[PDB]
Amino acid sequence: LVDIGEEARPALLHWKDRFKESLKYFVGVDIGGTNTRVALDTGSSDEPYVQIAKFRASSSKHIVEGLQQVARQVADILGVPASGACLAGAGRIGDDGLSLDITNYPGTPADRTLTSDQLPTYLFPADATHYINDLESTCYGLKSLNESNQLASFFKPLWSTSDTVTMKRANYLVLAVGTGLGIALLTSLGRGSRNIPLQVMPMEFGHALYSPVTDPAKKDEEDRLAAYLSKTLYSGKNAIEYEDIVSGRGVLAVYQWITAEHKEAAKYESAEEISAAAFREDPCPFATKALLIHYRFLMRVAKNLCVGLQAKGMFLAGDNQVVNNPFFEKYLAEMRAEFLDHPKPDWIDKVELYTQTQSFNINLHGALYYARTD
Amino acid sequence: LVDIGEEARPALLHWKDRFKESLKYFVGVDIGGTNTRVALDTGSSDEPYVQIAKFRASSSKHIVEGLQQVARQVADILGVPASGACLAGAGRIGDDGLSLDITNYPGTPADRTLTSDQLPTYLFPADATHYINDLESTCYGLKSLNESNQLASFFKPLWSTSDTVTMKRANYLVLAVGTGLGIALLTSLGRGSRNIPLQVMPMEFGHALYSPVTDPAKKDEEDRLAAYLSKTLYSGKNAIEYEDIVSGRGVLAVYQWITAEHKEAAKYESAEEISAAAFREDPCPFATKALLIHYRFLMRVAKNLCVGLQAKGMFLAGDNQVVNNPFFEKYLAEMRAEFLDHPKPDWIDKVELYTQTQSFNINLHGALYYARTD
Numbered sequence: 001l002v003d004i005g006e007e008a009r010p011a012l013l014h015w016k017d018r019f020k021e022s023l024k025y026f027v028g029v030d031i032g033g034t035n036t037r038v039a040l041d042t043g044s045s046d047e048p049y050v051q052i053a054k055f056r057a058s059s060s061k062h063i064v065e066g067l068q069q070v071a072r073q074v075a076d077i078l079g080v081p082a083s084g085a086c087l088a089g090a091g092r093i094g095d096d097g098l099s100l101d102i103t104n105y106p107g108t109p110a111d112r113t114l115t116s117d118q119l120p121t122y123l124f125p126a127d128a129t130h131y132i133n134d135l136e137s138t139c140y141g142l143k144s145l146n147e148s149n150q151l152a153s154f155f156k157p158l159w160s161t162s163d164t165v166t167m168k169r170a171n172y173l174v175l176a177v178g179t180g181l182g183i184a185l186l187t188s189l190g191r192g193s194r195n196i197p198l199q200v201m202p203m204e205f206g207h208a209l210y211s212p213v214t215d216p217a218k219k220d221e222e223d224r225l226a227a228y229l230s231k232t233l234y235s236g237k238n239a240i241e242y243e244d245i246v247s248g249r250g251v252l253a254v255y256q257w258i259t260a261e262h263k264e265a266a267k268y269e270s271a272e273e274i275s276a277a278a279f280r281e282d283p284c285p286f287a288t289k290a291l292l293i294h295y296r297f298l299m300r301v302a303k304n305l306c307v308g309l310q311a312k313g314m315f316l317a318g319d320n321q322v323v324n325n326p327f328f329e330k331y332l333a334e335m336r337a338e339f340l341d342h343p344k345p346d347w348i349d350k351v352e353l354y355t356q357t358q359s360f361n362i363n364l365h366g367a368l369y370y371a372r373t374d
Numbered sequence: 375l376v377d378i379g380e381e382a383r384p385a386l387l388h389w390k391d392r393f394k395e396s397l398k399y400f401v402g403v404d405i406g407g408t409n410t411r412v413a414l415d416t417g418s419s420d421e422p423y424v425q426i427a428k429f430r431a432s433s434s435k436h437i438v439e440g441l442q443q444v445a446r447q448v449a450d451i452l453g454v455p456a457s458g459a460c461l462a463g464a465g466r467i468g469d470d471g472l473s474l475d476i477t478n479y480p481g482t483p484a485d486r487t488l489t490s491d492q493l494p495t496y497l498f499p500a501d502a503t504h505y506i507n508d509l510e511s512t513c514y515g516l517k518s519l520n521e522s523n524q525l526a527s528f529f530k531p532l533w534s535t536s537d538t539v540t541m542k543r544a545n546y547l548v549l550a551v552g553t554g555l556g557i558a559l560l561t562s563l564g565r566g567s568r569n570i571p572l573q574v575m576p577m578e579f580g581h582a583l584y585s586p587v588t589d590p591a592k593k594d595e596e597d598r599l600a601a602y603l604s605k606t607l608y609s610g611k612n613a614i615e616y617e618d619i620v621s622g623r624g625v626l627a628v629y630q631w632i633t634a635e636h637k638e639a640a641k642y643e644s645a646e647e648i649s650a651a652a653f654r655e656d657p658c659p660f661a662t663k664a665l666l667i668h669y670r671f672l673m674r675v676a677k678n679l680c681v682g683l684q685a686k687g688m689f690l691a692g693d694n695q696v697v698n699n700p701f702f703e704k705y706l707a708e709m710r711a712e713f714l715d716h717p718k719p720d721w722i723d724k725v726e727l728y729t730q731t732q733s734f735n736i737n738l739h740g741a742l743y744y745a746r747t748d
């Protein structure tokens with residue numbers, strides 16, 4: 001059901017030609033919402049890494065069965081087991097890096113959990129395989145791009161005193177929106193003599209409870225929407241998480257609430273469709289409004305984390321952000337107004353904001369970096 | 375007007391006669407909410423460190439003038455300048471560790487800011503003096519206590535599968551309430567071969583905007599309190615920060631709001647008075663209600679940070695906590711119910727909770743630890 005592309009084979013064959021008995025390679029896996037991607041990397045930068053598989057998977061069983069097939073196909077080409085491996089995924093990581101609890105999968109906690117118990121040894125060696133979180137891997141991919149001097153080819157500034165994106169020794173939030181709200185922290189700890197290169201801190205602030213607004217022009221609408229989602233999602237028992245709005249499903253729910261009272265309102269069934277409705281030459285204000293509330297709440301969590309974590313900058317990552325940039329930039333004043341809506345605006349009015357400018361699987365990029373520097 | 379303690383002069387003379395010319399010592403300063411404390415430390419455990427001064431100060435001028443007087447008195451006794459120094463205070467630290475902006479002092483940011491060049495060289499050597507944040511210093515004091523096997527002498531468990539307080543390779547929140555809401559993270563980054571001993575991450579989440587509750591019995595009263603404090607503090611421009619409730623001034627503001635309609639209610643003028651009346655309960659326990667709301671909001675921000683930062687434990691520190699422990703324990707069930715009032719209680723219902731059991735300037739302890747290990 002899963003097959004290694006005939007486009008990747010010549011590169012892998014070339015690796016044997018070149019490295020002969022000394023061949024060693026690392027495995028990276030990116031478990032996306034819809035597709036899981038596998039790439040191999042020799043670890044010398046004069047040989048580009050090679051994406052070997054992309055297959056649809058939405059359950060631990062699918063993911064693991066696919067990885068088993070890919071492993072058998074690599075065994076018939078490279079003929080030597082991988083020397084290390086890293087898998088990135090949308091969930092919490094066990095203390096030892098040997099498990100991943102995929103937060104928004106259906107099923108029991110057992111159903112959502114990937115371990116290395118069923119991973120094929122050929123690609124995932126016993127003592128050198130680790131799971132990491134997806135925004136955690138985004139941070140490693142940013143570190144890798146920056147060490148290769150290519151970061152500015154993939155990110156541009158929206159708020160900055162400079163026209164090019166550079167990473168300093170400072171705290172940076174990294175955010176991406178898809179099946180969930182992903183947020184991680186690139187952090188510089190220690191001052192002066194104690195300073196350490198940027199470390200990656202995975203986080204789960206997508207699931208923190210939301211913060212309200214008192215701006216009268218918005219309080220009424222948000223109060224009604226929050227009450228409506230608490231009702232429909234939790235039967236009133238809890239307030240919403242940021243992720244209940246800042247996600248694919250949240251975009252759908254906000255739009256449905258916006259159009260709850262209009263039968264003739266264009267029905268859509270995915271954030272992708274609602275976004276496309278907001279991006280077309282004459283968009284319907286319902287779609288426009290849903291996306292604005294979505295992004296308002298992304299700016300709301302970002303503003304509180306920038307205060308709390310003393311971030312100097314923010315990266316908006318993800319291929320969907322590339323698609324959404326014209327809309328986000330068209331309403332950047334609305335974004336910035338929400339971001340500065342805080343009793344201490346001087347604490348954050350210099351925080352920089354960078355956005356991804358071309359599609360690129362930075363999660364896979366981070367997974368390979370992790371595996372080969374481990 | 376600022377004198378070195380008489381009890382301390384013989385201890386310093388003992389160092390002079392013992393180490394003579396080779397005398398090497400470090401300086402710790404704790405800028406507390408009322409008093410600033412100075413201690414000297416040889417760095418070797420065979421000499422207990424010596425607290426040499428405690429003086430009242432509430433502005434940068436008082437602090438610097440007091441430190442100048444202390445430096446002169448040390449110079450006359452010891453005749454050797456300090457080899458390193460560390461100052462802890464309630465605010466943001468400059469990137470180089472050479473400044474501190476005390477958040478809740480009045481005036482301009484310059485009025486609030488201490489730098490390292492205002493400091494007398496005798497106790498604060500060039501290239502070996504740093505400011506750190508107060509809750510950052512609490513963490514360094516916890517690490518020191520942990521390394522000296524004394525952690526359980528100052529903290530007891532409230533939520534734990536164990537009866538002795540330990541610090542493992544995991545994330546811990548550290549919290550203390552006074553002039554402000556202080557929170558810091560002891561973090562262990564890296565899984566597997568990448569794990570690093572606990573690092574300290576200062577934070578400013580006391581100034582993040584609050585989260586509401588939907589528990590219907592509490593929502594109405596909280597909405598009125600939040601709306602009233604937003605009108606009062608910010609003329610309704612913004613929602614309140616956690617610190618607007620979780621602080622000394624917060625305790626006062628909540629108690630005044632609660633008793634607005636009660637002309638005969640006791641007119642307490644300090645959070646300390648209110649806290650006292652809260653446990654020795656008045657026949658109409660308005661003070662009990664204000665302190666319950668205060669701690670509820672402390673639990674709410676802790677709840678969201680335990681989710682977001684994946685904390686495994688929490689330390690409630692500070693001399694205020696020692697005094698309020700009987701109240702806090704009496705209402706621990708209310709505390710836990712707020713903490714677990716989240717759509718994902720399984721994520722945090724194993725989080726451990728420790729409280730400080732005796733008064734101890736852990737901040738000063740951490741500053742000395744920072745100075746002698748830098």
Ligand SMILES: OC[C@H]1O[C@@H](O)[C@H](O)[C@@H](O)[C@@H]1O
Nearest residue numbers: 031032033034035036178179
């Ligand atoms: O699954 C990861 C992503 O891969 C992309 O190629 C697909 O178009 C998306 O639907 C998917 O979310």
Ligand SMILES: OC[C@H]1O[C@@H](O)[C@H](O)[C@@H](O)[C@@H]1O
Nearest residue numbers: 090091092103135180181182
């Ligand atoms: O995929 C983005 C984020 O979604 C959240 O729901 C998960 O809990 C996170 O671990 C993940 O980083």
Ligand SMILES: OC[C@H]1O[C@@H](O)[C@H](O)[C@@H](O)[C@@H]1O
Nearest residue numbers: 405406407408409410552693
């Ligand atoms: O200033 C730090 C602390 O010093 C103690 O001696 C006082 O009891 C407190 O009121 C004060 O906050």
Ligand SMILES: OC[C@H]1O[C@@H](O)[C@H](O)[C@@H](O)[C@@H]1O
Nearest residue numbers: 464465466477509554555556
């Ligand atoms: O003192 C507790 C806390 O008060 C806050 O208002 C300050 O901004 C923090 O830096 C400090 O840690």
